[PDB]
Scaffold this active site. Structure first.
Site: not given
Ligand code: HEM
Length: 291
Positions: A45, A49, A188
């Site tokens: 992530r 970002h 997820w």
């Molecule tokens: C419409 C696009 C996206 C939205 C709105 C979104 C939103 C989110 C949100 C709300 C979280 C949870 C953050 C938390 O509470 O720790 C998250 C986690 C994450 N996202 Fe996204 N995301 C999107 C696209 C992506 C993309 C494009 C990638 C990378 C290729 C990505 C990789 C991740 C990963 C790996 C996590 C888990 C982080 C953790 O466990 O600490 N996301 N995302």
């Protein structure tokens, strides 16, 4: 403004494989983080970002300048929790002070995907740190409470098409949402520190219920204890996205190949690679090296 890749002086593939390896060894060692999820997901992530602030219209933001190190960007509400990935990388940067910040943040993501048994992601060096005033304002990363039209329009700014968006979203197999961080809670799926196509399978096969979490936000929940954000769920509400979701749920190799391309592209958006730049590097995993 043009951002030309400039290879860290005198460095070659072996130097970056050493950085890879140090990241990978710390990923293995520091296994307790996040209730034993480990740092893989938050490093993926972080890479996203730090790259996803890019605007194709004027080449602002993007991975090149490593601007997350400045307080406006590290304190973006959208980046809440990523400080853990930054702190992980700090000893890496101390050992290898010659690597640029953008190169280290993006390489952290590549290394995490690969060490989590994901596809190989070719990676190019040459990001150069840019000054504090080049840090993009907050608000360029996406909202989670929106629909497919939002998602599609959002990602046009990153020059991503429907296939690239659906592929990139497969990274949500990894890690979890954390209520205090995003206002969403839950993983997820079951395999959340191994890179697989589980995100697509769960979207199609779980029995999802639209519930409110304890932050009063709606999310989709299953009896297995999994969740999807509204933007995740939008991928099966929109018929164009749905087709692609089904493709990746039914072909792991295709998902790997398309993810690899899209993720490299994401990490390279905004960078001009000279004609005589090195070819992209494909790092060996620790396992492949016998380490
Ligand atoms: C419409 C696009 C996206 C939205 C709105 C979104 C939103 C989110 C949100 C709300 C979280 C949870 C953050 C938390 O509470 O720790 C998250 C986690 C994450 N996202 Fe996204 N995301 C999107 C696209 C992506 C993309 C494009 C990638 C990378 C290729 C990505 C990789 C991740 C990963 C790996 C996590 C888990 C982080 C953790 O466990 O600490 N996301 N995302």
């Amino acid at each position: 403004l043009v951002h030309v890749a400039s290879v860290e002086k005198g460095r070659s593939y072996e130097d970056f494989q050493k950085v890879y390896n140090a990241i990978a060894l710390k990923l293995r060692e520091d296994d307790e983080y996040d209730n034993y999820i480990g740092y893989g997901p938050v490093l993926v992530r972080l890479a996203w970002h730090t790259s996803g602030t890019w605007d194709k219209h004027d080449n602002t933001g993007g991975s090149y300048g490593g601007t997350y190190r400045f307080k406006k960007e590290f304190n973006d509400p959208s980046n809440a929790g990523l400080q853990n990935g930054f702190k992980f990388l700090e000893p890496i940067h101390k050992e290898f002070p010659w690597i640029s910040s953008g190169d280290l943040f993006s390489l952290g993501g590549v290394t995490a995907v690969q060490e989590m048994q994901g596809p190989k992601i070719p990676w190019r060096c040459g990001r150069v740190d840019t000054p504090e005033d080049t840090t993009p304002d907050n608000g360029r990363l996406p909202d989670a409470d929106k629909d497919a039209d939002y998602v599609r329009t959002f990602f046009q700014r990153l020059n991503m098409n429907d296939r690239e968006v659906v592929a990139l979203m497969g990274a949500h197999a990894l890690g979890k949402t954390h209520l205090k961080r995003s206002g969403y809670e839950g993983p997820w799926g079951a395999a959340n520190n191994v890179f697989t196509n589980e995100f697509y399978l769960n979207l199609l096969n779980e029995d999802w219920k639209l519930e409110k979490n304890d932050a009063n936000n709606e999310q989709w929940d299953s009896k297995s204890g999994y969740m999807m954000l509204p933007t995740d769920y939008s991928l099966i509400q929109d018929p164009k996205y749905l087709s692609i979701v089904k493709e990746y749920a039914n072909d792991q190799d295709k998902f790997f190949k398309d993810f690899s391309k899209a993720f490299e592209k994401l990490l390279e958006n905004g960078i001009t690679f000279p004609k005589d730049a090195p070819s992209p590097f494909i790092f060996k995993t620790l396992e492949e090296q016998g380490l």
